[PDB]
Amino acid sequence: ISHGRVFRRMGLGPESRIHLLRNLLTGLVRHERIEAPWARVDEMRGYAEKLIDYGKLGDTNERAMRMADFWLTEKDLIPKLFQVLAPRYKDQTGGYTRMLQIPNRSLDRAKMAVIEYKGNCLPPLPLPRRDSHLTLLNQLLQGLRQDLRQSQEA
Amino acid sequence: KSGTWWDEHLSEENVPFIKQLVSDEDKAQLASKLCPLKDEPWPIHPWEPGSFRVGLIALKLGMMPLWTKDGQKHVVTLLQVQDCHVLKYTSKENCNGKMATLSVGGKTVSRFRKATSILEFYRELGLPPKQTVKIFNITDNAAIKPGTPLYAAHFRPGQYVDVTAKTIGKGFQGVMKRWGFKDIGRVWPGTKMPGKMGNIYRTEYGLKVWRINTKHNIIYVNGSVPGHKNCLVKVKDSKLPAYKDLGKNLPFPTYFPDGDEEELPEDLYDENVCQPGAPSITFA
Amino acid sequence: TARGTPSRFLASVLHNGLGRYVQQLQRLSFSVSRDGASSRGAREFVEREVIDFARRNPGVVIYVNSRPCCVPRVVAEYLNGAVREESIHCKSVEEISTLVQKLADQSGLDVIRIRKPFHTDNPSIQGQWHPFTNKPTTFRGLRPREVQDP
Amino acid sequence: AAPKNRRTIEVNRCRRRNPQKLIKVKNNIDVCPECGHLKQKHVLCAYCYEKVCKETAEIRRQIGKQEGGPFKAPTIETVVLYTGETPSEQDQGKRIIERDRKRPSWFTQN
RNA sequence: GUAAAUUUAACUGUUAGUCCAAAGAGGAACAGCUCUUUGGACACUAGGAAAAAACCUUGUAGAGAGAGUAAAAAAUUUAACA
RNA sequence: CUGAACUCCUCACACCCAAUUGGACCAAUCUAUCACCCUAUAGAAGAACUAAUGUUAGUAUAAGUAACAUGAAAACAUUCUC
RNA sequence: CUCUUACUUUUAACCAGUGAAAUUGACCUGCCCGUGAAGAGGCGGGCAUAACACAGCAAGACGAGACCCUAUGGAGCUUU
RNA sequence: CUAUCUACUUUCAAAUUCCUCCCUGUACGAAAGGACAAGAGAAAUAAGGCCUACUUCACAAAGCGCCUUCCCCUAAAUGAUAUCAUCUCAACUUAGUAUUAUACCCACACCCACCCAAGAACAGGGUUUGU
Ligand SMILES: [K+]
Ligand SMILES: [K+]
Ligand SMILES: [K+]
Ligand SMILES: [K+]
Ligand SMILES: [Mg+2]
Ligand SMILES: [Mg+2]
Ligand SMILES: [Mg+2]
Ligand SMILES: [Mg+2]
Ligand SMILES: [Mg+2]
Ligand SMILES: [Mg+2]
Ligand SMILES: [Mg+2]
Ligand SMILES: [Mg+2]
Ligand SMILES: [Mg+2]
Ligand SMILES: [Mg+2]
Ligand SMILES: [Mg+2]
Ligand SMILES: [Zn+2]
């Protein structure tokens, strides 16, 4: 029974799980786009979002610096977090990362995901795009919406 | 040939518009059933010994402590009635049963995830689709017109109710947890072995209604009911012999707030329930 | 197997015997060695028996081919197209005479299990039984527990 | 427990060829509009994704040369500039990565 | 009434007894038990007795989409006037 | 009345007993002489295999089961975790 | 132990790669009673019964799994 | 037991029990003695569930915690054989249990993806936040 068990069991145990996520998070901050097994990227995505929130507290904040020190193994990333990533998202209240499933990797056919920090310099990922408004179904719904405006106005 | 879902082909502009459009109609469809007594209601008969009125579907909010004037504590389960309406009436002959049946629906759910046949049934009735639909065996004098809303004040404090729901699913369990256990040449049918535990319908009989919240349509019922919180439960008058023929003073066939009566207080209490704003009790 | 083999019903070729009897055997082909111990009986049969058989059965055409062979054979062909090859290897004249006459009298139909020892195209003279054959009729064809003048 | 008897081919075919054992036909396959290759509806196109990764790898190799060592992550934003392009006013005061290539049509300067 | 018998010349294999009926002798007037005797059946067939080595019918050499038979189906409900 | 492999009926008739014995026949092989699409008369013999706790080879069943394996990201440079 | 509960790891189950063995007369492999039967999946009577994976279970089938006497046999060792 | 085969893996929920009080110092009882059900409270066990609090714990699971637990299992009268009598393997009548129950379950697209108090796989529920 695993009712309400939010966290996955990974690696060699609890401590190993955090270190596995920390290594993935450290790679994401440096590269801004990494690809790994889907479950691990999904497990790490929450920490990636929360790390940006600590970066918004500022480097002067002692608790935030302690968080960045632990979660960022490579210390040169800590300045990047507070001075690059955090200011980038100053306006946004969330949704810092986007996660997309990519084809299963050849060796073990593991389900794979790509996760990136929105706004990176890297070439854009081929995001899924909703159908054009000009399509037949959308045009029929656009006409319906316009009529409901006239009826509402009356 | 491929599969499709409702917003697969919708554009960014039309996803918010369609979501609003189908939500506004639902709110307007539930508001058009708020006056059943001026919409050609079926005959309203008086209660007679041997009558069986309909029940309702409620959602299990959770549990709370309740104290009585004798100084005892009681844990109750809060059951909230959400968008409960009568859906179908079947007479004795057609139902293949001694008693006629009234079909009642529970929580409102999205129309985009329901079968076409079910979507057509609700279209005729003029109500948003429900999550759960249950059948109640009623007498011919308790028939209620399909589409009539059912409220928590259909039950009153001091009454007993059977509550049926699916139990919390424990998955495949061993004999020790399932059955509490640590030679004719064959195993008997029915032998207790490991297998899927829980996730089956169970009934808790004879649970008294301590309190009713008319504003939020919440029934405070004694003890616990099967299933997880936020599950849908079937609430019905208790079938236990001691509680037979106590429906003489309960709303028959159901409670119509539209009807001509003084509006009920926000909360209805049982004589022995200590109300929140009452003075601190003394036992002298 | 009976289950492991085919079967057929008792039959004739062209209703043979109804108007006239026709011998179904039409051709016999013998292969006989000039030299060969196994053909001794066949050679003797050709010398003293084949000619008399040929006259008795003018409808049958008999081909005798003398050539080197280890197993002398007689191939019998019938009007219905059946072909039946038999071996006369090391058979005496009497045994060959018996086999040849047996081929002459056969119809050419497959020698397989025959389901019934009788065949008729007119099994009934008075009408085949049906459930109403021995049931009396009722006035106005009324059924059990049926009411006239409904 | 050892098997009591050899299982016949007749029995084994029923087991091995049961629908539950057969590969299910997939209905979520589609054609990618950009490249015309096949993809699943919920998965990024393999052909298009590899195209992005190839260019991303070249850019990362260029970033490595500019940094010229480990633990040298910059404290400013980065901008990729292709041949024939000049730094924008918005893209000023940022690390500039120069690619000896024309900007891909799918990669749009912002 | 029947057709076998003895002898001679050679030669081989089987033979560790089960049940039924009968008469004894031992056990317990037990055993699907111990011993002997008489007969039967069983390693030759088939039918019947519920399935059925041992009971009954029958013997046994093939084909038949004919016929006459053999053995072959358990019964039973238990007084009274004053 | 039904009901056998008993009996009758049409035809056939040497064709249901272990070991054992007696009398015939015979697959394939080789030899003599025949034969010459696969035979004959003889002579001979490493001469016939559903009955093996037998040998060797092939392939099944169990079973696609039990079981086995590569710390992480990346520019594949490197760095990180242990 | 009363009296067990929770979590982690391994195993496990699912996906992918690789891929054994003991075992196996044949098998179209049910229940009850009867039959020597507590010797019946296969016989008698009765009952039951559309087909076919996966995960469990260990009542049965089925298997992994001392002692006896007997043979005109030995060997140690003990000597009367 | 590395479990091939047989069998089996929800007969879903009518409940038992001991004590105290009460009925009651009542019916019976010469009297002493002293009911039975009817109920009331309190316990425990079993079955089924549940997490408000307590406890082990902490999006949750659990017990040492809490809640629920229901119908029933042979006389009477009259009266012949035998003009009394006689419960009748005499007949008629009445009563009487078995049977029957009640409760629960019940509608069907896409089944691509995500989530889940649902779950080994499969399946099931939700998606009217498919960021
Ligand atoms: K615990
Ligand atoms: K038995
Ligand atoms: K077992
Ligand atoms: K009497
Ligand atoms: Mg693991
Ligand atoms: Mg569950
Ligand atoms: Mg005879
Ligand atoms: Mg030999
Ligand atoms: Mg297995
Ligand atoms: Mg394994
Ligand atoms: Mg390992
Ligand atoms: Mg224990
Ligand atoms: Mg595998
Ligand atoms: Mg319990
Ligand atoms: Mg306990
Ligand atoms: Zn593409």
Short mmCIF file of C-alpha atoms in Angstrom, two decimals, chain C:
data_model
loop_
_atom_site.label_atom_id
_atom_site.label_comp_id
_atom_site.label_asym_id
_atom_site.label_seq_id
_atom_site.Cartn_x
_atom_site.Cartn_y
_atom_site.Cartn_z
CA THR C 1 -10.53 -48.52 -39.73
CA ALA C 2 -13.78 -46.94 -40.89
CA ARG C 3 -12.96 -43.61 -39.25
CA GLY C 4 -9.46 -43.69 -40.75
CA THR C 5 -10.59 -44.34 -44.35
CA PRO C 6 -13.07 -42.84 -46.82
CA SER C 7 -16.52 -44.20 -47.57
CA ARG C 8 -19.24 -44.05 -50.21
CA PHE C 9 -22.79 -45.24 -50.83
CA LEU C 10 -23.80 -48.26 -52.86
CA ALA C 11 -23.95 -47.14 -56.48
CA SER C 12 -23.74 -48.19 -60.11
CA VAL C 13 -22.26 -46.60 -63.23
CA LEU C 14 -24.94 -45.11 -65.51
CA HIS C 15 -27.62 -47.20 -63.79
CA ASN C 16 -25.93 -50.29 -65.21
CA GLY C 17 -28.35 -53.20 -65.47
CA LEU C 18 -31.52 -51.10 -65.53
CA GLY C 19 -31.89 -51.07 -69.31
CA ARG C 20 -29.02 -53.34 -70.29
CA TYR C 21 -25.87 -54.68 -68.67
CA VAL C 22 -22.60 -53.12 -69.82
CA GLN C 23 -19.25 -54.54 -68.74
CA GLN C 24 -17.42 -51.69 -67.03
CA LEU C 25 -13.97 -53.13 -67.71
CA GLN C 26 -12.79 -51.81 -71.07
CA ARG C 27 -9.00 -52.28 -71.14
CA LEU C 28 -6.43 -54.71 -69.73
CA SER C 29 -2.72 -54.01 -70.20
CA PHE C 30 -0.29 -56.83 -69.37
CA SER C 31 3.47 -56.39 -68.95
CA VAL C 32 5.26 -59.73 -69.28
CA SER C 33 8.95 -60.61 -69.34
CA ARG C 34 10.27 -62.92 -72.03
CA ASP C 35 12.89 -63.97 -69.47
CA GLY C 36 12.22 -63.74 -65.76
CA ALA C 37 11.11 -66.33 -63.24
CA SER C 38 8.48 -63.98 -61.80
CA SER C 39 6.84 -63.77 -65.26
CA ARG C 40 6.58 -67.55 -65.75
CA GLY C 41 2.91 -67.57 -64.76
CA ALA C 42 2.14 -64.51 -66.86
CA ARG C 43 3.88 -66.06 -69.88
CA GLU C 44 1.88 -69.27 -69.45
CA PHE C 45 -1.32 -67.24 -69.06
CA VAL C 46 -0.63 -65.45 -72.35
CA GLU C 47 0.01 -68.74 -74.16
CA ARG C 48 -3.10 -70.65 -73.08
CA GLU C 49 -5.59 -68.31 -71.35
CA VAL C 50 -5.48 -64.78 -72.78
CA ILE C 51 -6.91 -65.71 -76.19
CA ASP C 52 -9.93 -67.51 -74.72
CA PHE C 53 -10.54 -64.62 -72.32
CA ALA C 54 -10.31 -62.10 -75.17
CA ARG C 55 -13.02 -63.93 -77.13
CA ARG C 56 -15.27 -64.21 -74.07
CA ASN C 57 -14.95 -60.44 -73.41
CA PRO C 58 -15.09 -58.67 -76.80
CA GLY C 59 -15.86 -55.38 -75.04
CA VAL C 60 -12.45 -55.44 -73.36
CA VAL C 61 -9.33 -54.50 -75.34
CA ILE C 62 -6.29 -56.45 -74.14
CA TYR C 63 -2.76 -55.16 -74.69
CA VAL C 64 0.08 -57.61 -74.00
CA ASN C 65 3.49 -55.93 -73.94
CA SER C 66 6.46 -58.28 -73.68
CA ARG C 67 9.48 -56.44 -72.29
CA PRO C 68 12.12 -56.84 -69.57
CA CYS C 69 10.46 -56.45 -66.18
CA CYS C 70 11.01 -57.69 -62.65
CA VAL C 71 7.37 -57.30 -61.56
CA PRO C 72 4.79 -58.24 -64.21
CA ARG C 73 1.60 -56.23 -63.86
CA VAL C 74 -1.91 -55.98 -65.28
CA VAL C 75 -3.48 -52.52 -65.53
CA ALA C 76 -7.28 -52.54 -65.64
CA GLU C 77 -9.13 -49.45 -66.86
CA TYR C 78 -12.88 -48.95 -66.50
CA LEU C 79 -15.51 -46.88 -68.28
CA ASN C 80 -15.83 -44.46 -65.34
CA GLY C 81 -12.12 -43.61 -65.68
CA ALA C 82 -10.94 -45.76 -62.77
CA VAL C 83 -7.47 -47.26 -63.21
CA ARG C 84 -6.54 -50.32 -61.14
CA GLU C 85 -3.02 -51.74 -61.34
CA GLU C 86 -2.41 -55.26 -60.03
CA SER C 87 0.73 -57.36 -59.71
CA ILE C 88 0.93 -60.87 -61.14
CA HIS C 89 4.47 -61.36 -59.82
CA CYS C 90 5.21 -65.08 -59.37
CA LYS C 91 1.49 -65.92 -59.64
CA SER C 92 0.43 -69.20 -61.22
CA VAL C 93 -1.86 -69.31 -64.25
CA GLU C 94 -4.86 -70.24 -62.11
CA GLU C 95 -4.21 -67.32 -59.76
CA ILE C 96 -3.80 -64.95 -62.71
CA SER C 97 -6.98 -66.33 -64.28
CA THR C 98 -8.85 -65.66 -61.03
CA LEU C 99 -7.53 -62.10 -60.74
CA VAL C 100 -8.28 -61.25 -64.37
CA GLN C 101 -11.85 -62.55 -64.16
CA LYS C 102 -12.29 -60.64 -60.90
CA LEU C 103 -11.25 -57.42 -62.64
CA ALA C 104 -13.68 -58.20 -65.47
CA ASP C 105 -16.65 -58.38 -63.07
CA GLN C 106 -15.84 -55.27 -61.02
CA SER C 107 -17.54 -51.94 -61.72
CA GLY C 108 -14.47 -49.72 -61.30
CA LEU C 109 -15.87 -47.93 -58.25
CA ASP C 110 -13.50 -47.42 -55.33
CA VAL C 111 -13.18 -50.55 -53.18
CA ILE C 112 -13.82 -48.69 -49.92
CA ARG C 113 -16.30 -48.94 -47.07
CA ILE C 114 -19.87 -48.91 -48.39
CA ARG C 115 -22.14 -47.35 -45.78
CA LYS C 116 -25.34 -49.22 -46.63
CA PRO C 117 -25.73 -52.64 -48.30
CA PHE C 118 -28.67 -51.24 -50.28
CA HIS C 119 -29.49 -48.21 -52.41
CA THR C 120 -32.87 -46.98 -53.62
CA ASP C 121 -33.96 -43.77 -55.32
CA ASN C 122 -37.59 -44.46 -54.30
CA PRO C 123 -37.55 -45.50 -50.63
CA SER C 124 -41.26 -44.80 -50.05
CA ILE C 125 -44.34 -45.85 -52.02
CA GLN C 126 -46.95 -44.63 -49.53
CA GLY C 127 -45.34 -41.39 -48.36
CA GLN C 128 -42.44 -40.84 -45.98
CA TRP C 129 -43.45 -40.61 -42.33
CA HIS C 130 -43.88 -37.14 -40.86
CA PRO C 131 -45.20 -36.09 -37.41
CA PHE C 132 -48.75 -35.68 -38.78
CA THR C 133 -48.88 -39.03 -40.60
CA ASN C 134 -50.74 -40.72 -37.72
CA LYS C 135 -52.39 -37.70 -36.09
CA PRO C 136 -56.15 -37.19 -36.59
CA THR C 137 -57.49 -33.87 -37.80
CA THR C 138 -59.82 -31.77 -35.66
CA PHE C 139 -62.91 -29.78 -36.55
CA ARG C 140 -61.96 -26.29 -37.78
CA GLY C 141 -58.29 -27.11 -37.10
CA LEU C 142 -58.57 -25.85 -33.53
CA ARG C 143 -55.46 -26.10 -31.37
CA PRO C 144 -55.28 -27.44 -27.81
CA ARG C 145 -57.06 -25.01 -25.49
CA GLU C 146 -58.11 -22.79 -28.40
CA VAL C 147 -61.50 -21.08 -28.55
CA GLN C 148 -63.63 -20.88 -31.68
CA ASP C 149 -65.49 -17.65 -32.42
CA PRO C 150 -62.71 -15.67 -30.60
#
